Amino acid sequence: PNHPLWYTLCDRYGLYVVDEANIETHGMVPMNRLTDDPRWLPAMSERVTRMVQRDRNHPSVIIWSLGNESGHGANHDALYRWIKSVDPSRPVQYEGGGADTTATDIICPMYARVDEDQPFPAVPKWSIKKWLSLPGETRPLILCEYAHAMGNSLGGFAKYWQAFRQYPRLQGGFVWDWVDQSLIKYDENGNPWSAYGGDFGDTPNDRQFCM
Amino acid sequence: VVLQRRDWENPGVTQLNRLAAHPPFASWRNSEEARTDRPSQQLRSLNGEWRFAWFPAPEAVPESWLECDLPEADTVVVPSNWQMHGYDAPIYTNVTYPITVNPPFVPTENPTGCYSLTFNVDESWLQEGQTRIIFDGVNSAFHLWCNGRWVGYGQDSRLPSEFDLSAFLRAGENRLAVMVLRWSDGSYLEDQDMWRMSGIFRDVSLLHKPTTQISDFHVATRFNDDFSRAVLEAEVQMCGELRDYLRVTVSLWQGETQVASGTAPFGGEIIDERGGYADRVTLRLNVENPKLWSAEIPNLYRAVVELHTADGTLIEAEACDVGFREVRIENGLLLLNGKPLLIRGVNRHEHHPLHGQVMDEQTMVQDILLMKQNNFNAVRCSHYPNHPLWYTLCDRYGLYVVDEANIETHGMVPMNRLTDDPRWLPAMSERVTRMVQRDRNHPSVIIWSLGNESGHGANHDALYRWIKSVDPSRPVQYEGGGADTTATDIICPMYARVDEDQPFPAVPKWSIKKWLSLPGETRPLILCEYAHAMGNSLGGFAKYWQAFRQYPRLQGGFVWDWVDQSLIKYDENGNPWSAYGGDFGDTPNDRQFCMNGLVFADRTPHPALTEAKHQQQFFQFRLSGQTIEVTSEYLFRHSDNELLHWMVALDGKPLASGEVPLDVAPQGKQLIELPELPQPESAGQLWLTVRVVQPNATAWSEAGHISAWQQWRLAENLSVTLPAASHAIPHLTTSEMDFCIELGNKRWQFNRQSGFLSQMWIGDKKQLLTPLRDQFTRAPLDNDIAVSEATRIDPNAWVERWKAAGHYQAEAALLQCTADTLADAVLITTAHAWQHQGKTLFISRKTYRIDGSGQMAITVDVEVASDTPHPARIGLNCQLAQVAERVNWLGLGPQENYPDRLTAACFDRWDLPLSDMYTPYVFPSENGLRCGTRELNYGPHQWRGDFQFNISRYSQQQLMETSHRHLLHAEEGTWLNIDGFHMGIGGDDSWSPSVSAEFQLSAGRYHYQLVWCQK
Amino acid sequence: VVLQRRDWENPGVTQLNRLAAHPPFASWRNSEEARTDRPSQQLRSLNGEWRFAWFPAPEAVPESWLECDLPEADTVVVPSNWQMHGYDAPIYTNVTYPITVNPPFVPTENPTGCYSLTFNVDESWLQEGQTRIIFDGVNSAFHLWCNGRWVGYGQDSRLPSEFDLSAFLRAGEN
Ligand SMILES: OC[C@H]1O[C@@H](OC[C@H]2O[C@@H](O)[C@H](O)[C@@H](O)[C@@H]2O)[C@H](O)[C@@H](O)[C@H]1O
Ligand SMILES: [Mg+2]
Ligand SMILES: [Mg+2]
Ligand SMILES: [Mg+2]
Ligand SMILES: [Mg+2]
Ligand code: NA
Ligand code: NA
Ligand code: NA
Ligand code: NA
Ligand code: NA
């Protein structure tokens, strides 16, 4: 969840907001080790419930998200249902566990390609055009993350938009991401320069991947 | 810290240092012991004598108690409830919380039980592995210390709390200190309508596991379409250090035969982008033609889970009983093994009259045997997880179980105040999740329940989905918030009626037949509670069963409830008596409302139980000419332990009898052709009685067990032959005050001021202690009184309307009293008006005809004012002088039966001791009635006609005035009530009018006739 | 008690004495002010210059700090991240946790930011009603004291934690 002013500005300037719970357990093995564990339900529930209680009156918020990159656990299903019960006015989405689980109203993959399948075991990223028409699938597809804008990037961006325009149920996506996470450091001449992972003695680190 | 943190007033802390929940463990180090379920040396019981001290509050507990025994302490048996040892009072309240409603706070005067135990731990237990303590039940919250050091904290009174003691124990003598709080924030979720007690009330034990251990395992069974093939899937989890040489073997056993086995290293399938569970493995075993588990045939296999090394060294084994069965809802029907269930259920609290809420094997087995012997197949765990042995017995004897989370917030306003509050989600979630983790491997558990009477909150929806996600093998149900919310797979109302709607705002209870077909509704309906069996109750029970059988989607219900929650108290001579709310100084309280059972607290049956047995029969019957058609309501078993006994009798006199073996497929029919029946010489009604007998003993019944019966009227030959005219003629002696009739050593005296037969003489002996008068009232039943909360009165309750109309005050006023002499009889004619405050309620017009044979023919015609509440009865009563040993009658029996509860009773000649004609309900009321009686015999007396009667040493007046059975005194002589008509008893519920219209005395005018003679 | 219970290594405890969450409040005592979204006299900002001292662990924090200002502390801007002030290093890691994966435990060397503020409260605020403090964001967990007395605890770095200070405050300096 963002600084409270953010939602006030999106209300008044006009932007659709996905408001997302502060839950990410990416480094767990497997990813859902905590989110499938009932002992962690209480801590997870407060990150969801207190978000909804804070932000539910903001018109700019149109979709609730259960967090990011925490696999798919039973706690997700429980909290998904909690939101659906307390606030019918907004869809609920969540990408973890394959982007199309029982914990999401929207097929919301990250970095699924336009035409190319990536058939990873258990969590495949299908071509977005193909994903839509899988046997039994009826939901809309909106990428929660696509077009990774790292450095000299956004090749193939037009391929996404061509598909969004042609397919009714491909209703777009969220570019990753808005702003480089570089930090300012100062050299011996006092001159500011843009710094990334490792430049603060932080170790281990993932270098320029924050940009 | 412990005093400072006040964890018992924080719904955010429900435990400190508590271990994860899991299915029953024994940590066998021998696989054969695991297979055969023998005791385990690694699982030790700490039950027995502990030390105990009571304190008014936790602040009053002296610090020294942590380190050594209080000399003021007593030695007490554990498990126990401390109220049962007299340390403070048990409290009976229904809805209103026994504490001020101010969540999360509890009273500062918080009764505190200080338990301690000095015990030995062997060095071998501490040199290696993990030693944990297990508290299976502690009411309601507790802190634990071991050898003076704080270990942890636990809430939820109805599930086990476990703590690792490995770092706290020493070789030799150790001491546990357990501080148990009566009240905690957990109490807000524990508002079940029962005695409020506390203490260490379930088993305490120590379990040794190796450091490298089985930490969890789940057993699932999936099937093909015709159940000829099954896959057993066992997921196993470990704790400790992972090693490449580690293995898990799961073996399945049928008796002493191994049918399947699987072995694998640890390491689950990939589940996401980070891989899989390295500390888990899932074994899959194929089973061809498995023997299926049901309540009809509780076939069980044994699964053994072994943790071992690649080279064959066992580390430890765990095991459970496995029942191959599928539970699914399909097309609006609850199916078991592909067949629609008919739930013959009952709610059962864990209650003992001596031991409170402590459960034992003997009491459990006794309950299961009586349930099955009475055609029950299902039990609801109202309203909390049970003692672990309960499920093991239900697995093995065969009963379907609804396992229910320990959540009830009835007393909140509104009911969902906590359950819709996200602050109480953590506390609620633990009561659901830890139940599933414990009980999920039991085949007897077929339905999960989210609790009881906590309205419907968003927390329910979240926990509903949690269960659906972790365990798709079992439907989830929940009644709160109107019985058909989004948190329930089954429409599960409580006390919804068969035909009558009760349209309460927001939470209506529709007629169950109507409910099924509401627009958009597709689910099955099974009442979580129905037929409230409080005292003289279960009127209208047959109406439920007729409906269950006719409507596919009406799949039954659970009676409320099994056993009276009465407690034993002692008089000054040490004699025990049954006590209820208010008898322990407990206040406020809800009096007798804790007693709703089909059986007394000591498991003696109420009359209602036989009605339940009959209606819940597994064989149905029809008669067409000479043909009996027997239909089986079993789903799986052939009738391979059943024979039909038939009997034809003429007014109780056996004429013919035979037996035919039953060979009926499940759901099938068999036709039995009766032989040509010989025509009876005498006049009267021929009756056919059939009964189904089990020739062979079972695990649950003795040889010769009767499981079903039914009667039909056959040919009747009306008596046309007149009695030969008696020669003698009675004489009328008239005086100003009396009409006297004499015939030999027989006199009848009619008082002319009152208009009643005031006395009868056989020689010089008085026959009556009280004149024969009309009676229009009954000592009110619990259903009549209709109170669920002692404070609230329903002005619509029958007792209230009767009182307000003056039925219990009504004064007889004589209108007419004349005598006539006939050729061969004396005819007395009377008319009385019963009036209250100017208004005439009833008029009784009678004739008494006394002939030469000494028979008195009484004709009674009664008018009842249409605007007076329908009376409880229309009859006569008197106190007879005679006290005789036996009561003999031709009519419905042998047990107590009422107009809306007589289907189980059979018409025949019955002979009982007088005492059996009285039903000792703890709260006394009208009782012991027998209906459809044509002849009644007591001492020198005989009455003939078509009437209902009760006979006993207690007047309606005494029963009306006495609150407890033990306070009743035998009166002089015998009180006889003979009714031409008696109102239904009701019972659909016991807190509003529940007597169906067809059983109310609304006809306005009534006629009955009796003949009184000397036998 | 606070060092003993270690609430920051227990997922069962995500807060202590924290008030219920709610939508943004300003408690206007004038309706026209509420309509026009003008500043409320009942909603005050505590942003600005606070006092700050860094410690390697909570066990290294002196008890005196509860009662009075540490002379070794600095005056810093709040809101802030203390890495941006040079007190320790920001860490950039993608997937791998910046701490050993041993839930629910964290390192014993656990950088601890000791913030304090001396601030004034109008007497009118204490004569009636309820005065609460709102922390819109604290990363990653914190204990709160007011005038030396313990108030509460909170987790979740990205939502506000609110505490009733009504019984802890005096008129004038706090
Ligand atoms: O013995 C009653 C039995 O029924 C269930 O409901 C209790 C009953 O309480 C009354 O005060 C209310 O008016 C009524 O709404 C409610 O039905 C309960 O589930 C059982 O545990 C038990 O109390
Ligand atoms: Mg608590
Ligand atoms: Mg209740
Ligand atoms: Mg035994
Ligand atoms: Mg914590
Ligand atoms: Na589109
Ligand atoms: Na990145
Ligand atoms: Na049915
Ligand atoms: Na009751
Ligand atoms: Na048979």
Ligand code: NA
């Ligand atoms: Na009575």
